[model samples]
Target: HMIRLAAIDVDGNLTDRDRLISTKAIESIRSAEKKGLTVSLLSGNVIPVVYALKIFLGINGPVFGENGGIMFDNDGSIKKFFSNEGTNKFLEEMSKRTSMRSILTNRWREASTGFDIDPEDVDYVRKEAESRGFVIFYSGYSWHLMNRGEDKAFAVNKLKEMYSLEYDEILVIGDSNNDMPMFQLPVRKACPANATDNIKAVSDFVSDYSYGEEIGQIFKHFELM
Candidate 1:
């Protein structure tokens, strides 16, 4: 086996607004695991929040958080750290440039805030970032600023390196703009029907359903179970 791996984003992708995982999705994930697939959850959520999901989902795979700032090992060890060494300084500069407060969703929340950004402007940011060779992925109420050098592609590649896996052996499923980085990797990309047009456009395939059920359907489509 080439080591099948699934990297799934949490919010908008797996869990519903109530943070519940549908039975069908759970079954899909379990089926994948039973088939010797390594499953990992990727989220911009805080480590604790993602941990709660781990407990709820009853999965032993690793979880990546804070745009890859935190890593939860399969053995239940939680490793939390920042990926961008200059993130603080960059935020400071951003704060000075804009009137919006820096609203980070993780431990660095004190330095960030949730601002209402227009979608068109978000697209602008996306294009600008791309022009600079970076990929932009957005979700919910926050936007993550990561260099092309340090987004989900970077994290996924790291994971593959650690486990000796090939990109073609992995699958990435997500909804929303923040998934763009992971989608860029040379693996199968899937998204729910509820995903924004841009997201769906970039995906290799899209599920007809939404939320957890959609995730299940994607796995089924790929015969991952």
Candidate 2:
């Protein structure tokens, strides 16, 4: 098998709607490690949070955060792909229309922007964001805004290059639109049962199981287990 790395999303893919991770998912990650695959956490969350997850999850691969805006190499060095100035400006302007409740995690965010908006106002916010030429993605956890070129796939490609691996050697699993960019990569892609319609549209396989339970099945399907 050419696959050597597994890039997984944090929310909705590895954790449930309550943001709790399951033992099965933890075991699945450990299984991949034993199988000789480096497992990396690719998330829109900040580096600090993802780093904490990496430590606890026993992941030994690069840590990607703020979508594709930042990366933490295996050597512990940090690489930033973009600045949050554009996103901050967009958020500042968008806040005028309504009281934008910032996502608490954004305090640690350095490249992208995140905040919680009322469901009723999301469409309006999206439209306004698009009009301003900013790209926004809702991770099913919060609304994330970044510049045009920043996305999860960008970080994945960075991972691929850093490790001297081919795209086909990496398997990415995610469940939300924010993960769509990763799905777009030439790499192998899979998803849980709860993935968005757009996500399933690009996936090579969709496991019947949902949440963390789907992880092991996905690994088996791809023969990583």
Candidate 3:
């Protein structure tokens, strides 16, 4: 089947810790774009970060950021995606005391609080959050606060409706536990070599290459480039 959309996670797949995409990945995306495969960047980062990525890759699709809290597109559409003030305040104060204090990308974000945590601390932090009813999931590069059911799959379906796309027409790629929700959406799932065990466990296809270079593997899977 021909894939109409390719939803990709940013960190540890298309980019590194410094957010660098390899020349090969860029070329692959360009070729895919030319082949009429709509592309979207889905991650726990802010709109600005994903916006930059969109510009770099020249993707004409939307960006689902903040672990599905927000969606950014070149077209006109929207969502409030915010938590209650009390919940927001509580999470803010809580974040200040951890390794995540210095890294909360959107302390001002409405729907979720995406924080950059060390790779090693992601598991511990998420586990701690679970006991508190705080929905925390790591997007490979960061830990994000979700509003119970809020997740990339939700946003993806929302956008799917907006774009008029079908279920089997999508292909998703990611590298972390946070991406697991969207990965389970009955779409074609993929992950890079650097992807965590959980991500690979659910991925329909795991790339042989790591980071940006892994995008090439995805293209190969689709026989697009």
Candidate 4:
């Protein structure tokens, strides 16, 4: 109840592609902790990348990643992880119906463009997933798709239920397509000025500037200092 939680996105939000935390941003997070706010680092990057940022920013709290596939505990330990078993099974089965070699080749080749495969392919995947009572979410330059079952929103909701907190009490800040699940939550959402157009459009508020400056603005808005 002491401002409860402060969820932050890593790339392009707290730090840039070069992986540097702004002095103001670091101070902002430290200030929030000083005021008794529980800060969480939410990101699409794998555990290794998030761990690197955690060390750099001196952040301490849960880290949610890969939609909902992974969570790092408060003490920098892995608390829970969704199994990719289902996904691997689905892909294995799908390969029998289609040309696995062709799909793999196309997937790797198309990833280089930063553009997702055509809508037709996406639609097929979604339709099949729905028919099988599943969901799929895609993110980042790799366009790596995840079983929608393992998304950030689902993970956050699970955590919220486990901790007995109201969804509205949460505050999420992010800056990319991968952050969409966090944005989808009913909680207050903020984004940096440099966020992709889609992210900016969905955000409740756009910060005063881009990158870490925007992150600093968010902490200030919350009166963390």
Clashing pairs in 1: 102-112, 102-113, 103-112, 103-113, 104-112, 137-177, 137-178, 138-177, 138-178
lDDT of 2 by residue, 87-161 (tens): 887787778877666778878888989987777887887788777677766774677887787888887888888
lDDT of 4 by residue, 30-123 (tens): 8778777777786665665566666777776677655556776666576445555555565566556543212332222211111234544666
In every candidate, how many clashes are there?
9, 0, 3, 4
Candidate 4 positional error at 30, Å? 2.7
After superposition, which runs of candidate 2 have C-alpha atoms over 4 Å from their true positions? none
Of 1 and 3, the candidate ranking higher by lDDT: 3
TM-score of each: 0.74, 0.90, 0.81, 0.72
Residue 130 alpha-carbon offset, candidate 1, angstroms = 12
Ranking by lDDT, best first? 2, 3, 1, 4
lDDT of 1 by residue, 60-110 (tens): 578776666577787778775444444444545444544433554534332
**Cα lDDT over the full model 4:** 0.64
lDDT of 3 by residue, 77-141 (tens): 54556563534554566666656553545644656666666567667766766666667655555
Report the CA-based lDDT of candidate 3 relative to the real structure.
0.73
Model 3, runs deviating above 4 Å? 17-19, 76-78, 84-87, 92-104, 115-133, 140-142
User: What's the true lDDT of residue 117 in model 3?
Assistant: 61
Off by over 4 Å in 4: 17-24, 92-138, 196-204
**What are the Cα lDDT values of the candidates?**
0.68, 0.84, 0.73, 0.64
Reference-based lDDT, residue 208, model 2: 96
Off by over 4 Å in 1: 1-3, 17-23, 80-85, 89-98, 102-138, 145-148
